[PDB]
Amino acid sequence: IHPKNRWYKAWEMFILVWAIYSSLFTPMEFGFFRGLPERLFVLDIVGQIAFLVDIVLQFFVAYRDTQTYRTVYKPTRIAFRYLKSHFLMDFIGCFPWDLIYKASGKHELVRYLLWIRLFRVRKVVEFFQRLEKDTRINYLFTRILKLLFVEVYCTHTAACIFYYLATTLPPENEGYTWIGSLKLGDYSYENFREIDLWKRYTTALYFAIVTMATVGYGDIHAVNLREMIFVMIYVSFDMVLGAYLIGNITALIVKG
Amino acid sequence: IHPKNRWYKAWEMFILVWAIYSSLFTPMEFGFFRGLPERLFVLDIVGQIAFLVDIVLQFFVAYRDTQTYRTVYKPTRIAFRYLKSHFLMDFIGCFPWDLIYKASGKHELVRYLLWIRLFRVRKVVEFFQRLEKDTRINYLFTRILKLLFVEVYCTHTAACIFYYLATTLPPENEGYTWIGSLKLGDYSYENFREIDLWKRYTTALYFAIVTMATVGYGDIHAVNLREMIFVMIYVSFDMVLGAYLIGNITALIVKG
Amino acid sequence: IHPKNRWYKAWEMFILVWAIYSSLFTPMEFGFFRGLPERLFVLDIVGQIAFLVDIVLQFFVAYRDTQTYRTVYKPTRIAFRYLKSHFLMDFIGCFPWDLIYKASGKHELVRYLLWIRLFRVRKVVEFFQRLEKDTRINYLFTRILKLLFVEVYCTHTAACIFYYLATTLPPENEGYTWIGSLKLGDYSYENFREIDLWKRYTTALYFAIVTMATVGYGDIHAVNLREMIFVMIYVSFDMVLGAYLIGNITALIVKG
Amino acid sequence: IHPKNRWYKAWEMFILVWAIYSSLFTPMEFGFFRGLPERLFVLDIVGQIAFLVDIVLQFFVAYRDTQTYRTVYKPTRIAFRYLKSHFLMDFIGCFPWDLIYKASGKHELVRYLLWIRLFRVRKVVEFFQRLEKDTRINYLFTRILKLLFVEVYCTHTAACIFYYLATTLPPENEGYTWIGSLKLGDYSYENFREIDLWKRYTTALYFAIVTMATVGYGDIHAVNLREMIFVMIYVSFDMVLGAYLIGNITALIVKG
Numbered sequence A, B, C, D: 001i002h003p004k005n006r007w008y009k010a011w012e013m014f015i016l017v018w019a020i021y022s023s024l025f026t027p028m029e030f031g032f033f034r035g036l037p038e039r040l041f042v043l044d045i046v047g048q049i050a051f052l053v054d055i056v057l058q059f060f061v062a063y064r065d066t067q068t069y070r071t072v073y074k075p076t077r078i079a080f081r082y083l084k085s086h087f088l089m090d091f092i093g094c095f096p097w098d099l100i101y102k103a104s105g106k107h108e109l110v111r112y113l114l115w116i117r118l119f120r121v122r123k124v125v126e127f128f129q130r131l132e133k134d135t136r137i138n139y140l141f142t143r144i145l146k147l148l149f150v151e152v153y154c155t156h157t158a159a160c161i162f163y164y165l166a167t168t169l170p171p172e173n174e175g176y177t178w179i180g181s182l183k184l185g186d187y188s189y190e191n192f193r194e195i196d197l198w199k200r201y202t203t204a205l206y207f208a209i210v211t212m213a214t215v216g217y218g219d220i221h222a223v224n225l226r227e228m229i230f231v232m233i234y235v236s237f238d239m240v241l242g243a244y245l246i247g248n249i250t251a252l253i254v255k256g
């Protein structure tokens, strides 16, 4: 397959949108849902098959030889390259990990395996790499946009994990978590497993976002020991991320 | 009209002062007032007619040709240029948007339309551009002053919007907002729609200012779900603004 | 007088120490004391006479001509230069402003005049200028040390002013201030005008210091409307100061 | 002894691991333990004897001559160099400072002397110096990693000291400390000297880490006057450390 082909470019954009959706949904899937509900069933399936098509197409596309800028259309070379680079993980990731979880005795570890899907963000990474290679956009502006996307995605994933760490404790001993002890205004999170999904997600995202900016107000904070450790890890990584963002912005203004 | 004319320069300064007042007052107009009170009536009218005169004058003045530095005084060219660039928005914004709101059944969308008047900040933007063009002031210092003004104005507008988001909820369900749940010292905001305008404005501005500096104390925070989303958007934009300011300062120090 | 004379250098160091003490004490004098207590009386007088001697000596020393590097010892030139630049304010600030306050009906404005002494920091400013001129120390390191001293001194002055703003309210209506509403641990600041000076000073300095670093915990915050305005001004100035410090550090690492 | 000898390199790595352990444990030993519990007895002795062996070996190895790059193996020179630079305090710190404390009337000052052992971090310092000398790693990346390690270690030591400052007060007057007044969720630190070591350490580390990132939430803050002073010193030093880290990152991005 000719790499720049008009149809292949459209397929790349389509799979990029699907990858963005899957990367944004999988942490939500794992954290806010101890097993998918019925309505999204078919949705999950089509996503899988969509990525399946991508696999059955990834065996066909020719690859640029990095050391020597020469295209290769031999099927053996491309097959072997896919085999070593990005085959086993995509295959193990597009398995149906929800029906497996429900059927196989509801063992959590098999869902813990649901995080295996996150390397679909490699599609967005390659998107940003191509955008950097393009001359219409400045290199450092592309780098900063990539960093902003990375910060937003890490904040979203951290919010999902932070909510998940509240469901680890038994439901009876729930007042000892970050959520369930909140009393914002007149609303008290008495039973936080019966509230609407969007309310809990927005609360967790609000906490994660105000922690990343470094405002830290203090209305939502850590109570458990696991939540404390997660908060320390998150802020330690966030500080370096923010320093890097400031560094690239300063670099463009100084040199660009 | 000769572009550099002494009288036209005085008119430009007068319109700049009026535009600064209008830009600082329109968010206050929209947020803190569900309809103007009677006292400022004539004041509002005066501003409108002033800008009307500006529009009448904006047609007469000749324009500089950017691609080829030749000044052209033909009325048709300046008329067409003003028609294309900055005519429709200025006129639609110079309509009386207060008496219309009161007469036409007190509908909210027409008052939402009052935000059109913020395009008068283009006058301050052009003023800073002229200051940058002037050789008496360093370019990066001008950029940093512009950035500081942008940060202050965005903080003021964010404070106005944050107070407005508290009035969206019905008056009976008011303890579920950022204001109305405050208990700073001995003063509790029991009925926050009966307090003086300056107290509410100062409280909102205090919250917005301590959120922008990133102190985030935590005496004033978000409670509603709409307030949470607004806070996330505010801090996400403010982080980039502050990083840009730090980059500009470091740029002048390193290079200048 | 020969500018580099060994005795004059010792006198300069002596007056530098006295100026540092006076600059650190005058905000404390104004804020924490509605009139000096008896014990420090003679101390105050001593400082005055010391600075008196300084100005008496300052009329004698020769001055360097910046435009043309030619030293002048003609007393008329140095006398006129001192009359022009730095005479009137030192004289008016070296008046006894405590006995004047106590004798003249305890009027508050004459005590507000006590802030004139803050221009003794010009001694430290010139000290840092000389240190920058010296080749033993790197220029940007000297600039950063000066910036850190400025930040610390501004924090100390802001703490003094913040405590003073709590004493403007009447003693009966004291629970509406930043102090007097504190309940840190088991200690409640019931009557904050009868507590030891060091406790109140340390509380105010703790608030100011954690506001400057941008931690902002939220145990000590603003309640009054005047305190809110002071906090906004302080954080707005502190943000620029911190950005400048980051810029200078980055400059030395990048270029030095 | 030949400096680059592989057995000596293995010994250096072994002593480096022991030094990392000792540096991470000594603040914990001093703060969280008023005398070691019996179980770690032999462990302590082992560390001591290990460092003893290091001292015994440190005499044998030849030293690089900095001014003139000639290797000298004469035992008198390496001896005198060790006697001058880094022995007296290595030995004084290699003394058994726990059994001394228990036997000699449980006097606190000899335990304060336990802080001498922190200069085993010179091993990690020389670790990073050699890594900087190595050409496989960029110099500024090595500096950034060293700064990150310094920040983490200073945070750990500050957490240990902050917990120690809570034990200085008598156990009866314990509610006036940073710990013992905590009411995180349903858990109240009623008697904080009976809780598990890991819970107290994690709480102190959580406070120190969120103070360093500058989030400052406000659930754990200072109450005592000693804690206030320690917090001011910590944040004043941490601000400079963070500015230095941002400067190094920006320099690497701009120049490298």
Ligand SMILES: [K+]
Pocket: A215, A216, A217, A218, B215, B216, B217, B218, C215, C216, C217, C218, D215, D216, D217, D218
């Ligand atoms: K806070």
Ligand SMILES: [K+]
Pocket: A214, A215, A216, B214, B215, B216, C214, C215, C216, D214, D215, D216
């Ligand atoms: K903060």
